[PDB]
Protein backbone atom coordinates (compact mmCIF):
# COMPACT_ATOMS: atom_id res chain seq x y z
CA UNK A 1 0.00 0.00 0.00
CA UNK A 2 0.93 3.69 0.13
CA UNK A 3 3.60 4.45 2.74
CA UNK A 4 3.49 7.80 4.56
CA UNK A 5 6.68 9.23 6.08
CA UNK A 6 6.47 12.24 8.40
CA UNK A 7 9.27 14.61 9.38
CA UNK A 8 10.38 15.51 11.96
CA UNK A 9 9.34 12.88 14.49
CA UNK A 10 9.52 15.47 17.28
CA UNK A 11 9.92 19.22 17.62
CA UNK A 12 9.76 21.93 20.26
CA UNK A 13 9.24 25.63 19.62
CA UNK A 14 8.22 28.72 21.51
CA UNK A 15 4.72 30.17 21.54
CA UNK A 16 4.28 32.31 18.44
CA UNK A 17 6.80 30.40 16.35
CA UNK A 18 6.03 29.18 12.86
CA UNK A 19 6.52 25.42 12.61
CA UNK A 20 6.35 23.15 9.58
CA UNK A 21 5.76 19.39 9.39
CA UNK A 22 6.25 17.44 6.17
CA UNK A 23 4.68 14.23 4.87
CA UNK A 24 6.03 12.27 1.91
CA UNK A 25 3.96 9.55 0.26
CA UNK A 26 5.53 6.59 -1.51
CA UNK A 27 3.54 7.59 -4.63
CA UNK A 28 1.45 10.53 -5.83
CA UNK A 29 -1.82 10.93 -3.94
CA UNK A 30 -3.35 13.80 -5.93
CA UNK A 31 -3.97 16.05 -2.90
CA UNK A 32 -6.09 13.34 -1.19
CA UNK A 33 -4.54 14.09 2.18
CA UNK A 34 -5.81 14.99 5.64
CA UNK A 35 -4.08 16.35 8.72
CA UNK A 36 -5.23 15.25 12.20
CA UNK A 37 -4.29 16.53 15.65
CA UNK A 38 -4.30 14.29 18.74
CA UNK A 39 -4.13 16.12 22.04
CA UNK A 40 -3.02 14.25 25.18
CA UNK A 41 -5.69 11.83 26.38
CA UNK A 42 -8.02 12.53 23.45
CA UNK A 43 -9.11 11.04 20.15
CA UNK A 44 -7.62 12.59 16.99
CA UNK A 45 -9.54 15.45 15.39
CA UNK A 46 -9.15 16.49 11.77
CA UNK A 47 -7.56 19.84 10.97
CA UNK A 48 -7.96 19.72 7.22
CA UNK A 49 -8.69 17.58 4.16
CA UNK A 50 -7.76 17.78 0.47
CA UNK A 51 -4.35 18.79 1.93
CA UNK A 52 -5.38 22.42 2.47
CA UNK A 53 -9.14 22.72 3.17
CA UNK A 54 -9.64 23.57 6.84
CA UNK A 55 -12.52 22.08 8.79
CA UNK A 56 -15.19 24.23 10.42
CA UNK A 57 -13.85 25.93 13.54
CA UNK A 58 -10.19 25.12 12.89
CA UNK A 59 -8.08 28.21 13.71
CA UNK A 60 -6.57 30.01 10.72
CA UNK A 61 -3.03 29.53 12.08
CA UNK A 62 -3.21 26.01 10.56
CA UNK A 63 -2.54 25.72 6.83
CA UNK A 64 -1.66 22.98 4.36
CA UNK A 65 0.30 22.90 1.11
CA UNK A 66 1.95 20.51 -1.32
CA UNK A 67 1.18 18.30 -4.29
CA UNK A 68 1.99 14.91 -5.77
CA UNK A 69 3.69 12.96 -3.00
CA UNK A 70 5.02 15.90 -0.93
CA UNK A 71 2.87 17.83 1.55
CA UNK A 72 3.33 20.15 4.52
CA UNK A 73 1.33 21.36 7.52
CA UNK A 74 2.26 24.80 8.85
CA UNK A 75 1.31 26.24 12.23
CA UNK A 76 1.74 30.02 11.88
CA UNK A 77 1.99 31.12 15.49
CA UNK A 78 2.11 28.13 17.80
CA UNK A 79 -0.23 28.39 20.80
CA UNK A 80 0.14 26.77 24.24
CA UNK A 81 -2.84 24.48 23.55
CA UNK A 82 -1.18 23.13 20.38
CA UNK A 83 0.71 20.44 22.37
CA UNK A 84 -0.17 17.31 20.44
CA UNK A 85 0.81 14.58 17.99
CA UNK A 86 0.04 15.49 14.37
CA UNK A 87 -0.66 12.87 11.69
CA UNK A 88 -1.02 12.96 7.94
CA UNK A 89 -3.40 10.52 6.23
CA UNK A 90 -3.81 9.52 2.59
CA UNK A 91 -7.18 8.53 1.15
CA UNK A 92 -6.10 8.12 -2.46
CA UNK A 93 -6.33 4.31 -2.16
CA UNK A 94 -7.40 1.61 0.23
CA UNK A 95 -6.13 0.76 2.72
CA UNK A 96 -6.17 4.14 4.42
CA UNK A 97 -2.71 4.84 5.81
CA UNK A 98 -1.35 7.41 8.28
CA UNK A 99 2.03 8.97 8.85
CA UNK A 100 3.97 7.94 11.93
CA UNK A 101 3.18 11.19 13.72
CA UNK A 102 5.00 14.34 14.80
CA UNK A 103 5.04 15.23 18.49
CA UNK A 104 4.86 18.98 19.14
CA UNK A 105 5.98 20.41 22.48
CA UNK A 106 6.13 24.04 23.62
CA UNK A 107 9.27 25.83 24.74
CA UNK A 108 8.60 28.22 27.61
CA UNK A 109 10.41 29.95 30.45
CA UNK A 110 12.10 27.87 33.13
CA UNK A 111 9.82 26.97 36.05
CA UNK A 112 11.16 25.35 39.20
CA UNK A 113 9.35 22.25 40.50
CA UNK A 114 7.44 22.25 43.75
CA UNK A 115 8.79 19.23 45.63
CA UNK A 116 6.76 17.00 47.97
CA UNK A 117 7.54 13.73 49.75
CA UNK A 118 4.91 11.17 50.76
CA UNK A 119 5.69 8.58 53.42
CA UNK A 120 3.88 5.25 53.03
CA UNK A 121 0.70 4.72 54.98
CA UNK A 122 0.75 1.87 57.46
CA UNK A 123 -1.78 -0.06 55.40
CA UNK A 124 1.16 -0.14 52.98
CA UNK A 125 3.37 -1.17 55.89
CA UNK A 126 0.99 -4.04 56.68
CA UNK A 127 1.01 -5.11 53.01
CA UNK A 128 4.58 -6.48 52.73
CA UNK A 129 5.85 -3.80 50.31
CA UNK A 130 6.28 -0.05 50.86
CA UNK A 131 6.38 2.84 48.37
CA UNK A 132 7.78 6.30 49.18
CA UNK A 133 6.66 8.92 46.66
CA UNK A 134 8.50 12.11 45.69
CA UNK A 135 6.54 14.53 43.49
CA UNK A 136 8.02 17.31 41.33
CA UNK A 137 5.09 19.51 40.35
CA UNK A 138 4.66 21.93 37.44
CA UNK A 139 8.20 22.46 36.17
CA UNK A 140 9.96 23.26 32.90
CA UNK A 141 12.10 22.04 31.27
CA UNK A 142 11.39 18.31 31.46
CA UNK A 143 14.94 17.43 32.54
CA UNK A 144 15.35 16.97 36.29
CA UNK A 145 17.44 14.91 38.71
CA UNK A 146 15.98 13.04 41.70
CA UNK A 147 18.18 11.33 44.29
CA UNK A 148 16.84 9.08 47.04
CA UNK A 149 18.47 9.17 50.47
CA UNK A 150 18.07 6.64 53.26
CA UNK A 151 19.65 7.80 56.51
CA UNK A 152 22.07 9.74 54.29
CA UNK A 153 23.10 6.92 51.92
CA UNK A 154 22.02 6.94 48.29
CA UNK A 155 19.42 4.37 47.22
CA UNK A 156 18.81 4.51 43.47
CA UNK A 157 18.46 0.83 42.56
CA UNK A 158 14.78 0.51 43.52
CA UNK A 159 13.25 3.77 42.28
CA UNK A 160 11.19 4.44 39.18
CA UNK A 161 9.99 7.64 37.53
CA UNK A 162 6.91 8.67 35.58
CA UNK A 163 6.32 11.98 33.77
CA UNK A 164 3.08 13.54 32.61
CA UNK A 165 2.55 14.82 29.12
CA UNK A 166 3.06 18.55 28.67
CA UNK A 167 0.20 20.57 30.14
CA UNK A 168 -1.97 22.27 27.53
CA UNK A 169 -2.40 25.53 29.50
CA UNK A 170 0.85 26.27 31.36
CA UNK A 171 3.09 23.96 29.26
CA UNK A 172 4.75 22.42 32.34
CA UNK A 173 5.49 18.84 33.34
CA UNK A 174 5.06 16.89 36.56
CA UNK A 175 7.09 13.88 37.67
CA UNK A 176 6.84 11.13 40.27
CA UNK A 177 9.78 9.17 41.66
CA UNK A 178 8.71 6.11 43.65
CA UNK A 179 11.11 4.18 45.90
CA UNK A 180 9.97 0.60 46.54
CA UNK A 181 11.28 -1.42 49.49
CA UNK A 182 10.31 -4.29 51.72
CA UNK A 183 8.68 -3.48 55.04
CA UNK A 184 11.56 -4.90 57.03
CA UNK A 185 14.07 -2.87 55.02
CA UNK A 186 11.87 0.24 55.33
CA UNK A 187 11.44 -0.07 59.10
CA UNK A 188 15.19 -0.71 59.57
CA UNK A 189 15.90 2.90 58.49
CA UNK A 190 14.97 6.13 60.02
CA UNK A 191 14.76 9.26 57.84
CA UNK A 192 13.89 9.27 54.13
CA UNK A 193 14.62 12.17 51.79
CA UNK A 194 14.41 13.02 48.11
CA UNK A 195 16.84 15.56 46.66
CA UNK A 196 15.95 17.43 43.47
CA UNK A 197 18.20 19.38 41.13
CA UNK A 198 16.70 21.37 38.26
CA UNK A 199 17.59 24.41 36.17
CA UNK A 200 15.01 26.47 38.07
CA UNK A 201 16.53 25.75 41.50
CA UNK A 202 19.39 27.92 42.77
CA UNK A 203 20.34 25.14 45.20
CA UNK A 204 19.18 21.51 45.30
CA UNK A 205 15.93 21.06 47.23
CA UNK A 206 15.65 18.15 49.65
CA UNK A 207 12.40 17.02 51.27
CA UNK A 208 12.55 14.66 54.21
CA UNK A 209 10.57 12.77 56.82
CA UNK A 210 11.20 10.81 60.02
CA UNK A 211 9.87 7.27 60.19
CA UNK A 212 7.68 6.95 63.28
Amino acid sequence: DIQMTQSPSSLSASVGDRVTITCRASQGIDNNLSWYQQKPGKAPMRLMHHSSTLETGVPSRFSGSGSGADYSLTISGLQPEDVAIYYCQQYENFPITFGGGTKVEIKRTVAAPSVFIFPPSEDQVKSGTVSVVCLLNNFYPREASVKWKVDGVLKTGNSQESVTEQDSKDNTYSLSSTLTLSNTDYQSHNVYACEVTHQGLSSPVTKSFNRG
Binding site: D30, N32, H49, Y91, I96
Partner: peptide, 8 residues
Protein backbone atom coordinates in the same frame (compact mmCIF):
# COMPACT_ATOMS: atom_id res chain seq x y z
CA UNK B 1 -10.16 8.92 -4.07
CA UNK B 2 -11.67 6.78 -1.29
CA UNK B 3 -12.99 7.32 2.22
CA UNK B 4 -14.13 10.89 2.80
CA UNK B 5 -13.09 11.51 -0.82
CA UNK B 6 -15.30 8.83 -2.39
CA UNK B 7 -17.65 9.94 -5.16
CA UNK B 8 -21.07 8.49 -5.95
Amino acid sequence: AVGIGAVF
